[PDB]
């Protein structure tokens, strides 16, 4: 639809990704390191919406990593949260084949990357 709708969908995605990031950073746990060591596949280039395939394919492991680290203090509802992230991605990505970087990263770097991605596109749309 309008250029504004894409902008609205991106910030929706952005905020959800930031929710996960901010939740993790403020998380304080002894066995928290288990969640951070896990490697995530990264996009080689994230320039346009079509590159969101790299995020989509990594959504399920993102869910599973978050699901594994679910204590009293850390409650994010991964299944529903990712589903919310997923349906937004599909509205944006809408058969490109994801190309991945050779270097893997942690969940923090993974989140920051796609957070930067949304911000990069939004700034251009404005």
């Amino acid at each position, epitope marked *: 639809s309008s250029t504004k709708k894409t902008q609205l969908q991106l910030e929706h995605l952005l*905020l959800d990704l930031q929710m996960i990031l901010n939740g993790i950073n403020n998380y304080k746990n002894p066995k928290l390191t288990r969640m951070l060591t896990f490697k995530f596949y990264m996009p080689k280039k994230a320039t346009e919406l079509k590159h969101l395939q790299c995020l989509e394919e990594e959504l399920k492991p993102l869910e599973e990593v978050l699901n594994l680290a679910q204590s009293k203090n850390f409650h994010l509802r991964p299944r529903d949260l990712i589903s919310n992230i997923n349906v937004i991605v599909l509205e944006l990505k809408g058969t490109f084949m994801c190309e991945y970087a050779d270097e893997t990263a942690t969940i923090v770097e993974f989140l920051n990357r796609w957070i930067t991605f949304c911000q990069s596109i939004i700034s251009t749309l404005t």
Partner: antibody
Amino acid sequence: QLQLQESGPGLVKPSQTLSLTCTVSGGSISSGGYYWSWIRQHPGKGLEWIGYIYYSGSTYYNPSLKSRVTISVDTSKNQFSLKLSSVTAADTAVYYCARTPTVTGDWFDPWGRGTLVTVSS
Amino acid sequence: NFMLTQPHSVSESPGKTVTISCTRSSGSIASNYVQWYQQRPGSSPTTVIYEDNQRPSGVPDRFSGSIDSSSNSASLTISGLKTEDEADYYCQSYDSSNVVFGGGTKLTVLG
């Protein structure tokens, strides 16, 4: 002081869609620190969670009500609303809007005054 | 998803101590924080206990919360029962699936 106020029709006929709206005053939907929820209570029965929404727009529903509910948020007017489709006499209840922290866990504080919705034709 | 089972009613004379149990049907109850809400008739619920045993400023020290892993339950204990304590009490926890309320318990202060 942060106060929440539910707004509804009070009287709605069965099979219609119930539209509620919560208005945040003395506060705003300006941080990711909270979920914004809807809770209902059938007269003489217990409390039942309906769902809540994040200020991003992402929603989380009760599995038993997921197929009938839809929650939206309006950060500009500091309001969030609920739509409950195809209501019956079983949907007659006092509907509450409430606030709950994110991450730390689900805990509703504060609650709105609650509004009584009577479903009859 | 799970259920929280509370007794329908509990009652004791003023000054005594009463306990309201909250049993979780599925999953460990120590895995999620348990909240306790007090509701007066025709009024909105207020918090007396949040996060298992934490007590909001303004709530009397008579109110205390605990968790029993053995019986998979959560308990609200009120000492020195007062007539103001006469109300409905709801235990509440959460899951990866949804938010779960107890069936509610009517506390009666015997007059």
